[PDB]
A paper describes a structure:
Although the cryo-EM structure of the [name] filament achieved near-atomic resolution for the inner core of the filament, the resolution of the outer domains was substantially lower, prohibiting even the tracing of the main chain of the D2 and D3 domains. Thus, we expressed and purified the fragment of [name] between residues 178–395 that forms the D2 and D3 domains and crystallized both the native protein and its selenomethionine derivative in the P2 space group with 2 molecules in the asymmetric unit. Employing multi-wavelength anomalous dispersion (MAD) phasing methods, we arrived at a 1.47 Å resolution structure revealing the D2 and D3 domains as a contiguous barrel-like structure composed predominantly of β-strands, with D3 positioned directly above D2 along the filament axis towards the distal end of the filament. While D3 in S. Typhimurium is inserted into D2 and they form two separated domains, a different topology of the secondary structural elements in [name] [name] results in the D2 and D3 domains folding into a single bilobal structure with two distinct surfaces, the concave surface facing the filament core, and the convex surface exposed to the outside. Starting from the N-terminus, the first β-strand is incorporated into the D3 moiety, before the backbone turns downward, forming one half of D2. The sequence between 243 and 353 is entirely a part of D3, after which the polypeptide chain returns to complete the fold of D2. On the concave side of the D2/D3 domain, residues between 233 and 242 belong to the β4-strand that occupies central position spanning both D2 and D3 and together with strands 7, 8, 10 and 11 of D3 and strand 13 of D2 they form an antiparallel β-sheet. The consequence of this organization is the tight packing of D2 and D3 which are oriented along the filament, instead of projecting away from it as in the S. Typhimurium. Compared to the previously determined structure of the type A PAK [name], our type B [name] [name] outer domains are oriented similarly relative to the inner core.
Numbering used by the authors: 180 to 378
Write the structure that this text describes.
């Protein structure tokens, strides 16, 4: 078991260019992965690429705001091609509320429960990118745990926004979930495929 290093987590640069080699049902197919591709785009390319292969994409993560002091957090959020500016965020509830106010523009669901767990979904698998911290806070972070194709959330969080020293892993790429009644393999040179699928 190795998990993907880009899909299903937050990274600095998102998906790297590469080629995915698919073999199954006696067919061989090569799929171009473009730099910055979303799970949505990758799934669109892979779905039905060989017979019976299903590919679905979703970007789902929990987000927690912690340690905000000296002011409040301001930062942009981009989902796919749509961007909004959040400001005055000091708690997870604040984040939830502002994501919800912007939910139509962003094409997301942002659901926070009474235990403070905020789950954010791009149902089709668009990338979610966090902008630089431009608010007054002198400390504080937004940290995320992303869901994988196995339905499990990361147990360890990564900062996507931080006051003071900037977060580095700001791009959440969703998962690509493959299913098939028949055997198939996915591979690539180096990490070109495993950045999406693990090994």
């Amino acid at each position: 078991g190795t998990v993907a290093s880009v899909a299903g987590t937050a990274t600095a640069s998102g998906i790297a260019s590469g080629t995915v080699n698919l073999v199954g049902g006696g067919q061989v197919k090569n799929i171009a992965i473009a730099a910055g591709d979303s799970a949505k785009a990758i799934a669109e390319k892979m779905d039905g690429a060989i017979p019976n292969l299903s590919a679905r994409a979703r970007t789902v993560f929990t987000a927690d705001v912690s340690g905000v002091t000296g002011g409040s957090l301001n930062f942009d959020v981009t989902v796919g091609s749509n961007t909004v500016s959040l400001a005055g965020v000091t708690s997870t509830q604040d984040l939830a509320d502002q994501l919800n106010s912007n939910s139509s523009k962003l094409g997301i669901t942002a659901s926070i429960n009474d235990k403070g767990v905020l789950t954010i979904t791009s149902a089709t698998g668009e990338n979610v990118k966090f902008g630089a911290q431009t608010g007054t806070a002198t400390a504080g972070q937004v940290a995320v745990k992303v869901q994988g194709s196995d339905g499990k959330f990361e147990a360890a969080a990564k900062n996507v926004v931080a006051a003071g020293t900037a977060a580095t892993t700001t791009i959440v790429t969703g998962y690509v979930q493959l299913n098939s009644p028949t055997a198939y393999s996915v591979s690539g040179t180096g990490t070109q495929a495993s950045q999406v699928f693990g090994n």
